[model samples]
Target: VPETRPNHTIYINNLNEKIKKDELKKSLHAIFSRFGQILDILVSRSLKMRGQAFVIFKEVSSATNALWSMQGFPFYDKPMRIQYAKTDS
Candidate 1:
C-alpha cells in the first residue's frame, strides 16, 4: 500500500467525483482525523485532481496507520487507492 518513503501524508485517488469538493474534504477529514491530528485535507474539482486528494497528518505514525486502515476502503461507492504523498505536505 506504501510506495513512497514514510511521511505524514497520504495520497488518495480513484475517488468518486459526484460529491461536492467542500463536502468531500470534510468527509475525508472526519475519517482520517481519527488516526491523528490533521494538518490539512486537499481536494480539487479540476480535471486532474477531481478524483484525487491528499490527507496530511501531524505525525508520520498517524499517516501510516490511516494509510493502512483506509486502503481499498469503499468510500462513496468506490474502492479508494492510496499511497504516501510523493511530496511533503
Candidate 2:
C-alpha cells in the first residue's frame, strides 16, 4: 500500500509490544542479522510506535533477503510483518 521503493531498511509491525525495547532489539538483531550485517535495529519508546520497528541492513540485497525470509517469523508470540520502508532508509 506504499508508493515507496525498496531500500536498506525493512519496516516491521504486528510485533509483541509487551517485550522491552532492549530485549526486542536483541531478538530482532538475532533474527535479521542472518541475512547480512545489521546496521541498526529501531525499537521505539513512544506508545504510538510500539509493536513496530525498523531493521536496517548495510546492503539492499541483504535487506531484500531479510524481507522475504523473515516476513512471517514469529517473535514473542506474534508474527511480524516485514516490508520495504515506505519513507526509504
- Winning candidate number (lDDT): 1
Residue pairs of candidate 2 with colliding backbone atoms: none
lDDT of 2 by residue, 1-89 (tens): 74247789888989997899999999888888889998889889898899999888899899888888987888888888888887623
lDDT (0 to 1) per candidate: 0.89, 0.86
Pairs in clash, predicted candidate 1: none
Cα lDDT of model 1 by residue, 1-89, tens digit: 44778789888989998999999998898788899899989898799899999898899899899988999999999999989888544
Error of 1 at 22 (Å): 0.8
- Residue 16 accuracy (lDDT) in model 1: 96
Each prediction's TM-score versus the true structure: 0.91, 0.90
At residue 6, candidate 2 shows an lDDT of 70
